[PDB]
């Protein structure tokens, strides 16, 4: 099914601080009792992170499509399991293949398909109050897919859609990276009891699964359960209410970290090698403590702010047809010589027209030949047999 949602309320965004969160084991090796560094994409600590929420108070579900940055951090403080999946892709309209993730009472599923997703998709999750049971009653998420190229399924093992609101008591953290045609998922659950904010202290995520996909992803969306009951009169696009759920997303960027492995090989602490001059000094010595003293670090430079180009005011174009498609050639024993001067060249108009069998170059790369400026430019030309073209190379005999 598909529809457009109605009766929403929308509000300006909210923001919080990225306390230390975004760390994981970078690969399946094991190390312990050691300090080690890696250069990787990460969430910088104290990053400004956007806060999203949905509350009745109004019906503040607006759940907009968000841009998939080259990496995403996702976490939610959880209650009643309102997150049911995610959507990732570019066009989202079967003009490209796209990735879907779902967790429903039939199956837990990952699929890459020519999905024609809906313009404002959701699960029409509804309550059988007469038997106090919650279920999706409308699959209002995609109408169709023209083909599917990857499909995977897991059981509806614990698809509990019922609960009661309050302070969040759970925390599921996720990181999504697509690189080299592979989606890598890293995850952590943590039990919490916190007043509706990012936690304090530290923990690190583990790799879950690594799935090949050919597609490029530029936009993403969260797949969520709505609520419908006798309290929510309307149609299947107005007869709904907001819950109290919240979630946060942080966008990854290039980083260097130093990582502390305990005797058990768990990342008990980490240091951002770029946050601060003290932090950079810690990274410089490769130690978490530094004694009273003076130290030196990476040099200071000033970036080039503009670019300029100053060629002379040439106007003429060089001879070309009068060389490469001339009427006649010399016998090779008496090879011809020609001058080129006071003119502009272009090889690309040669490559796109002349069916040369060979176009070797030495000491220069031909792709760059348009980028340069030259002196003493001469052409030699002659005719030889097809076998004999072998001889025309430096140090031939």
């Amino acid at each position: 099914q598909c529809v457009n949602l109605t009766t929403r309320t929308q509000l300006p965004p909210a923001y919080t601080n990225s306390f230390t969160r975004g760390v994981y084991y970078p690969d399946k090796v094991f190390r312990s009792s050691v300090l080690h560094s890696t250069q990787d994409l990460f969430l910088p600590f104290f990053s400004n992170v956007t806060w999203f929420h949905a509350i009745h108070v109004t019906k503040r579900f607006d759940n907009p499509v968000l841009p998939f940055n080259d990496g995403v951090y996702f976490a939610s403080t959880e209650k009643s399991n309102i997150i049911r999946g995610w959507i990732f892709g570019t066009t989202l309209d079967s003009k490209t293949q796209s990735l879907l993730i779902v967790n429903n009472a039939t199956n837990v599923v990952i699929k890459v398909c020519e999905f024609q997703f809906c313009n404002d998709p959701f699960l029409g999750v509804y309550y059988h109050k007469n038997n106090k049971s919650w279920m999706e009653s409308e699959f209002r998420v995609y109408s169709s897919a023209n083909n599917c190229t990857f499909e995977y399924v897991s059981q509806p093992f614990l698809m509990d859609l019922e609960g009661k609101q309050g302070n969040f008591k759970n925390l599921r953290e996720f990181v999504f990276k697509n690189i080299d045609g592979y989606f890598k998922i890293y995850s952590k659950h943590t039990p919490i009891n916190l007043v509706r904010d990012l936690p304090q202290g530290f923990s690190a995520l583990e790799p879950l699964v690594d799935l090949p996909i050919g597609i490029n992803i530029t936009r993403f969306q969260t797949l969520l359960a709505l609520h419908r009951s006798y309290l929510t009169p309307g149609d299947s696009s107005s007869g709904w209410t907001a819950g109290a759920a919240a979630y946060y997303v942080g966008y990854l960027q290039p980083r260097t970290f130093l990582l502390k492995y305990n005797e058990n090989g768990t990342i008990t602490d980490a240091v951002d090698c770029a946050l601060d001059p003290l932090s950079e000094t810690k990274c410089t010595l490769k130690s978490f403590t530094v004694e009273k003293g003076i130290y030196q670090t990476s040099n200071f430079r000033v970036q080039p702010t503009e670019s300029i180009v100053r060629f002379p005011n040439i106007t003429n174009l060089c001879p070309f047809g009068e060389v490469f498609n001339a009427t006649r050639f010399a016998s090779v024993y008496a090879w011809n010589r020609k001058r080129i001067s006071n003119c502009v060249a272009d090889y690309s108009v040669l490559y796109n027209s002349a069916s040369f069998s060979t176009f070797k170059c030495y000491g220069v790369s031909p792709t760059k030949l348009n980028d340069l400026c030259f002196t003493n430019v001469y052409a030699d030309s002659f005719v030889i047999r097809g076998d004999e073209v072998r001889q025309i190379a430096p140090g031939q005999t």
Binding site: G363, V364, K368, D371, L372
Partner: protein, 50 residues
């Protein structure tokens, strides 16, 4: 003075100034040429420290 003059030595690379090579040649050919200057420059630097 000797250490600064050593920048002009080509060590059998195509040119003394890297920007000449790194302009006029594409990566898979530059990366077997610039490789020589680095070895030549390091050894001149190593000698100075000793």
């Amino acid at each position: 003075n000797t250490l600064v003059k050593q920048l002009s030595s080509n060590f059998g690379a195509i040119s003394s100034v890297l920007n000449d090579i790194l302009s006029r040649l594409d990566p898979p050919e530059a990366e077997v040429q610039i490789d020589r200057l680095i070895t030549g420059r390091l050894q001149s630097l190593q000698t100075y420290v000793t």
